[PDB]
Amino acid sequence: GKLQDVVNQNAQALNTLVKQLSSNFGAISSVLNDILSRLDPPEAEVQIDRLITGRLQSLQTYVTQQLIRAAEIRASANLAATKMSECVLGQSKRVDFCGKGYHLMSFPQSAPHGVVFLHVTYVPAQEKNFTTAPAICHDGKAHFPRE
Amino acid sequence: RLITGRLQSLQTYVTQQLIRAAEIRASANLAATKMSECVLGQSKRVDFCGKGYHLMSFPQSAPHGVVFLHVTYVPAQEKNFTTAPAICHDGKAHFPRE
Amino acid sequence: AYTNSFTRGVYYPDKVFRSSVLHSTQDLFLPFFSNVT
Amino acid sequence: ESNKKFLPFQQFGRDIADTTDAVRDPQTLEILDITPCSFGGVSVITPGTNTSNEVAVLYQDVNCTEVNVFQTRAGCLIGAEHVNNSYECDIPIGAGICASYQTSQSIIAYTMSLGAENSVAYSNNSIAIPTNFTISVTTEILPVSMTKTSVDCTMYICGDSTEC
Amino acid sequence: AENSVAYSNNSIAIPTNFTISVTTEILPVSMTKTSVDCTMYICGDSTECSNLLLQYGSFCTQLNRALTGIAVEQDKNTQEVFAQVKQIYKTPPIKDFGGFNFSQILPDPSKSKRSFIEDLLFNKVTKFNGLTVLPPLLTDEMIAQYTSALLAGTITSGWTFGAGPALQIPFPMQMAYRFNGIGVTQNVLYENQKLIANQFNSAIGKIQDSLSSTPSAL
Ligand SMILES: *[C@@H]1O[C@H](CO)[C@@H](O)[C@H](O)[C@H]1NC(C)=O
Numbered sequence: 001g002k003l004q005d006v007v008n009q010n011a012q013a014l015n016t017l018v019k020q021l022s023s024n025f026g027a028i029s030s031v032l033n034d035i036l037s038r039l040d041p042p043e044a045e046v047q048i049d050r051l052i053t054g055r056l057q058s059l060q061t062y063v064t065q066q067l068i069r070a071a072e073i074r075a076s077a078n079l080a081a082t083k084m085s086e087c088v089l090g091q092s093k094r095v096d097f098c099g100k101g102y103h104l105m106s107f108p109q110s111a112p113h114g115v116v117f118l119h120v121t122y123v124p125a126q127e128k129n130f131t132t133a134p135a136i137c138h139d140g141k142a143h144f145p146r147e
Numbered sequence: 148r149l150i151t152g153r154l155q156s157l158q159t160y161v162t163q164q165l166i167r168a169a170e171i172r173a174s175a176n177l178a179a180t181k182m183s184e185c186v187l188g189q190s191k192r193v194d195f196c197g198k199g200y201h202l203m204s205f206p207q208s209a210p211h212g213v214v215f216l217h218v219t220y221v222p223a224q225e226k227n228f229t230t231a232p233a234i235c236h237d238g239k240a241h242f243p244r245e
Numbered sequence: 246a247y248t249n250s251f252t253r254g255v256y257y258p259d260k261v262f263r264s265s266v267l268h269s270t271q272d273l274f275l276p277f278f279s280n281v282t
Numbered sequence: 283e284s285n286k287k288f289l290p291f292q293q294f295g296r297d298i299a300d301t302t303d304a305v306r307d308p309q310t311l312e313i314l315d316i317t318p319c320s321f322g323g324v325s326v327i328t329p330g331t332n333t334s335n336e337v338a339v340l341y342q343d344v345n346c347t348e349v350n351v352f353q354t355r356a357g358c359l360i361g362a363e364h365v366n367n368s369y370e371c372d373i374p375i376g377a378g379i380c381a382s383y384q385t386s387q388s389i390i391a392y393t394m395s396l397g398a399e400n401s402v403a404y405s406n407n408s409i410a411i412p413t414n415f416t417i418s419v420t421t422e423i424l425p426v427s428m429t430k431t432s433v434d435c436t437m438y439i440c441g442d443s444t445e446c
Numbered sequence: 447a448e449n450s451v452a453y454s455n456n457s458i459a460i461p462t463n464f465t466i467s468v469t470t471e472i473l474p475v476s477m478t479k480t481s482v483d484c485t486m487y488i489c490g491d492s493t494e495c496s497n498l499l500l501q502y503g504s505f506c507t508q509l510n511r512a513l514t515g516i517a518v519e520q521d522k523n524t525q526e527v528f529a530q531v532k533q534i535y536k537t538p539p540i541k542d543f544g545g546f547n548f549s550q551i552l553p554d555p556s557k558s559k560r561s562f563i564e565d566l567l568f569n570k571v572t573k574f575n576g577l578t579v580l581p582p583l584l585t586d587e588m589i590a591q592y593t594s595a596l597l598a599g600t601i602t603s604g605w606t607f608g609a610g611p612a613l614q615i616p617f618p619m620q621m622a623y624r625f626n627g628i629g630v631t632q633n634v635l636y637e638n639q640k641l642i643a644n645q646f647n648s649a650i651g652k653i654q655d656s657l658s659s660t661p662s663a664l
């Protein structure tokens with residue numbers, strides 16, 4: 001749903017861009033030839049001005065939302081480029097970066113406009129209670145485990 | 148004239164909201180990362196979880212935010228010494244293990 | 246003679262009631278620390 | 283019936299946003315508070331039509347007196363039972379209320395629970411050590427690119443129009 | 447301030463003591479879920495204005511879509527940060543954590559079941575046109591229930607609870623693991639546990655003062 005959500009957002013933004021052609025923006029008609037034929041050039045210029053200004057903003061808005069959206073994808077392409085340098089091309093020690101567990105390795109899989117990481121992690125299981133001791137004394141000296 | 152003036156005033160507000168909300172998402176992704184790596188495990192990334200040698204961190208909530216208390220170990224009271232890369236005892240070089 | 250109008254000359258420019266507000270308005274006010282004849 | 287104490291000569295009331303708030307009645311010199319009559323949005327809480335066609339309607343920021351009828355912080359919830367239990371969130375609503383379609387079956391509206399309780403048997407000499415393991419393989423999906431779309435000025439705005 | 451290290455080719459400096467300093471980092475995570483209506487803001491109670499607005503098409507079918515996506519995301523931001531642990535952990539009724547004192551960060555039942563420090567942060571930081579502010583999905587009582595699970599899980603289990611089944615370990619012993627992870631042997635902590643517990647407790651206490659003294663911290 002992450003890669004699909006990217007596709008829908010772009011298509012809806014483009015469809016909204018097209019459908020804005022069927023708006024008067026305070027002019028008489030939304031068709032360029034209809035307003036041209038119906039009226040005289042001295043008057044059609046005002047109606048031409050109303051449409052183009054309405055269509056400039058509609059094009060201006062689309063690019064701005066594209067610049068904001070494209071910067072949201074660059075922050076995901078920089079994370080995926082980082083999850084491949086550190087998870088795939090080496091073993092990670094950053095917690096929850098390459099999956100929930102103790103990271104072992106990862107395998108990239110491509111996808112349409114995206115990438116899928118399969119994070120192989122080692123998960124402990126079957127815990128058992130025990131009794132611990134910071135150190136043990138045998139000959140009047142304290143012994144600490146090495147590892 | 149009014150509605151066009153009010154459309155732009157509403158259009159501007161949303162655009163500055165989209166730019167500002169993307170500045171908060173870059174802080175919610177950092178705080179989510181400072182909790183996976185500082186709180187839920189001990190970090191070895193320098194100055195990520197506080198200035199020092201990281202030991203542990205404790206999250207504290209706040210209104211529209213989060214506060215991390217980064218427990219770090221700071222060395223102190225340095226003393227000069229004289230060092231040696233290796234020492235020779237029987238014609239062989241000895242290097243420290245750790 | 247001339248004298249210094251320290252802080253006086255301030256009036257209510259309207260009827261409205263404002264509670265704990267630093268309202269800023271432009272109207273004909275007596276300039277602060279002016280010279281009263 | 284307000285509570286502000288206007289000055290003797292004052293007939294208006296205003297907020298920081300220069301919006302009219304209180305008025306003094308000219309006939310009886312009593313101050314009146316003005317609150318705009320309730321507005322908001324309507325949201326339809328529904329399980330999938332693949333499951334059922336029974337929906338619950340929420341009116342945002344309403345005291346239920348302006349519209350079986352549950353009143354929350356998000357607004358007046360109509361058509362959803364209120365349960366005193368607490369399950370995982372299914373459909374978010376707000377302020378911790380999550381509605382879900384469950385057992386016949388209808389739409390409930392509970393306060394979501396923050397996971398299953400657990401308390402670690404912690405002492406000052408007890409340690410737990412794993413004895414086995416599992417090799418779990420999880421999947422992470424990340425978008426990396428978009429569609430390279432370009433739009434022409436002349437063709438989009440003034441398609442086939444020299445005058446434009 | 448100027449400083450020049452007394453550097454030679456056989457001189458090395460080695461620390462002999464240490465301090466356990468506890469620093470504070472503040473990060474914004476969410477905003478207010480604000481929505482604005484087209485008809486009410488632009489043409490509030492005006493049929494004539496509303497009819498002419500329809501000529502612009504769907505300019506503000508987008509704006510209600512843009513402002514909603516922000517709001518549904520502001521709830522994701524809060525969910526990624528806190529909602530990371532599954533089981534809601536709890537501290538034991540006893541508090542003998544090797545001599546370490548967590549009362550200033552752990553919830554106290556003498557209150558909003560927040561802690562001492564969380565309350566300092568909450569005390570410190572403090573419509574006619576379709577400006578509807580939506581409520582956050584996770585109320586602040588749930589969020590502070592989440593940070594107690596992380597606090598209680600860390601104290602009793604260490605880092606073993608974010609990686610799988612939660613395995614308990616004494617807090618005096620867990621810090622020996624943490625010390626051993628920065629190049630310092632275990633016996634440094636055990637031999638100086640009494641000093642270290644006081645250093646940890648003293649440093650935590652200064653946190654409340656540092657927020658309480660100056661209000662520019664948050
Ligand atoms: C005006 O004010 C100044 C200083 O504020 C004072 O010296 C002077 O006497 C006043 N009067 C005139 C007529 O300048």
Ligand SMILES: *[C@@H]1O[C@H](CO)[C@@H](O)[C@H](O)[C@H]1NC(C)=O
Pocket residue numbers: 345347
């Ligand atoms: C709704 O109105 C009732 C009057 O019966 C009042 O007591 C109550 O506080 C109101 N509730 C809200 C949530 O505004």
